[PDB]
């Protein structure tokens, strides 16, 4: 939670999100639903796939990792081989566990940053047309049909044609 | 209408992971890089079946034991298998010089033609 | 079709971390003395 979006100012997740990660909930007049944000979730899934596959493939493959056996007169050799195997295992355990933990944290704040960047993206597209509330939600001042969603998720939300309507709704009396 | 809402995907999953800032934290999706399952049996490696020495030592078949002459006389193997402390190994008692070196060498063979000089 | 084996069974998997057994014949991952290297791959379950 470095960027403080997930578990920050977006208190809880959504159980109905099944198609994508960083979706929406457009409680507009024409209907509702949990349409995902295809660009952001596709890029995020791509990124995590690169991360995991890099973790797998970079590990080189060799045909043996087996400690050999020794009789009762090569206790030096047996102890040395045990030291090599145990040191390799210790280094691998430390490195692998610190990795797993560290890029677990990187994955968490990367999802945090994706939700963040999405939030500031929508906020910049809307500027002051739609007021902000808690939980990362929004409140469009103007009348808002489904074409809003088309423009919002394609990034082509043209501010000026809805500007004056919001200006009227700022006070409304 | 109005009220768009950015959010994130939650689900009924109960998988938990450990991070470097928190332990036992619940997530949505995860993956187990650790392997803790196996077939429980012995089968081919690199496409070639491993050698099978039922209750026989490496010396037990390398030096043909009367009890170990029932071996599967194959041609190639990817790794040999020995019972832990097999009973019918060297039938005559003694010391196998450089036994461990021989075992390490005979671990893999691509063609094993049993001749007689 | 095992690509590597441990004494107590064959690891059919192809991931870099295994805790089944140190002795691993084949192009096999390296042993890890831990029990859970579950990497997160998604969000935090906050319903």
């Amino acid at each position, epitope marked *: 939670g470095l960027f403080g979006a997930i578990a920050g100012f977006i208190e809880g997740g959504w159980t109905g999100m099944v198609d994508g990660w960083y979706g929406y909930h457009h409680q507009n007049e024409q209907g509702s639903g949990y349409a995902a944000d295809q660009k952001s979730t596709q890029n995020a899934i791509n990124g995590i*796939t690169n991360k995991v596959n890099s973790v797998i493939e970079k590990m080189n493959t060799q045909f043996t990792a087996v400690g050999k056996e020794f009789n009762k007169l090569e206790r030096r050799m047996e102890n040395l081989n045990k030291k090599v195997d145990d040191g390799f295992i210790d280094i691998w355990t430390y490195n692998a566990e610190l990795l797993v933990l560290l890029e677990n944290e990187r994955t968490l704040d990367f999802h945090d940053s994706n939700v963040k960047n999405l939030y500031e993206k929508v906020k910049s597209q809307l500027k002051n047309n739609a007021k902000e509330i808690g939980n990362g939600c929004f409140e469009f001042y103007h009348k808002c049909n489904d074409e809003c969603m088309e423009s919002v998720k*394609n990034g082509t939300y043209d501010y000026p044609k809805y500007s004056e309507e919001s200006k009227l709704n700022r006070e409304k009396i | 209408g109005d009220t768009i809402c950015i959010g994130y995907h939650a689900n009924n999953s109960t998988d938990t992971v450990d991070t470097v800032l928190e332990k036992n934290v619940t997530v949505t999706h995860s993956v187990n890089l650790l392997e803790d399952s196996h077939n429980g049996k012995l089968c081919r490696l690199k496409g070639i079946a491993p050698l099978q020495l039922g209750n026989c030592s490496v010396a037990g078949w390398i030096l043909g034991n009367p009890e170990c002459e029932l071996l599967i006389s194959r041609e190639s193997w990817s790794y040999i298998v020995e019972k832990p402390n097999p009973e019918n190994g060297t039938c005559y008692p003694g010391h196998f010089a450089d036994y461990e070196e021989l075992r390490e060498q005979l671990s893999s063979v691509s063609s094993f033609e049993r001749f007689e000089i | 079709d095992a690509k590597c084996q441990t004494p107590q069974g064959a690891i059919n998997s*192809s*991931l870099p971390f295994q805790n089944v057994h140190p002795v691993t014949i084949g192009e096999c991952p390296k042993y890890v003395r831990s029990a859970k290297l579950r990497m997160v791959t998604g969000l935090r379950n906050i319903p």
Partner: antibody
Amino acid sequence: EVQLVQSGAEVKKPGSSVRVSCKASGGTFSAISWVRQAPGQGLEWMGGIIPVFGTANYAQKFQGRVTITADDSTSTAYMEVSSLRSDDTAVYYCAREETWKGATIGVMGIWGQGTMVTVSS
Amino acid sequence: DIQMTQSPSSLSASVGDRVTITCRASQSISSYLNWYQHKPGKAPKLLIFTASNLQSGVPSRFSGGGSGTDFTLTISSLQPEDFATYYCQQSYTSPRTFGQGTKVEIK
């Protein structure tokens, strides 16, 4: 460049199950896609899973009859279709979802080779 | 859910000509298109992914383009080794629908 080695060729009677493998060369977590090449018809994507979500998505005209499972341990995708019928005679192609710019999702990248699955008498 | 209507259905040409394959989509799929050539009796393989990028190990004569509901694939010139049917895929939302197939044959 993951050398996908799919299963062999097999035939079965109508009204049964099928098992077509997509055994890869190296451990990979990119998505999996399956496509039907019926003679004389074009390609159409049937089902697929994403090892990130873990959910198994399917075509809206195929769900239930077809299931896809790919254990992350071996990264080998399995192909099951229940209640086989004659017009499903085709050759099956499996995609590993990996281009030059890393593992990207929404593309096909490298492809399989083909498994002849003909349902007849 | 979204149908990929290939256009034109099928034409013929010769070595070193100008041909355009248009993929039409009902709903806007942004720029998550593909372009697969399918040799008869061979595994299919893509040329352009995300409607602009070029796959590695592919001649530069293929240049995709367009976004939204109108797309394109502009071949610079035709050689005797790239005559086949062509498909366009959408991946903006599931399900993933392929195309009809535009064949090119010796004039």
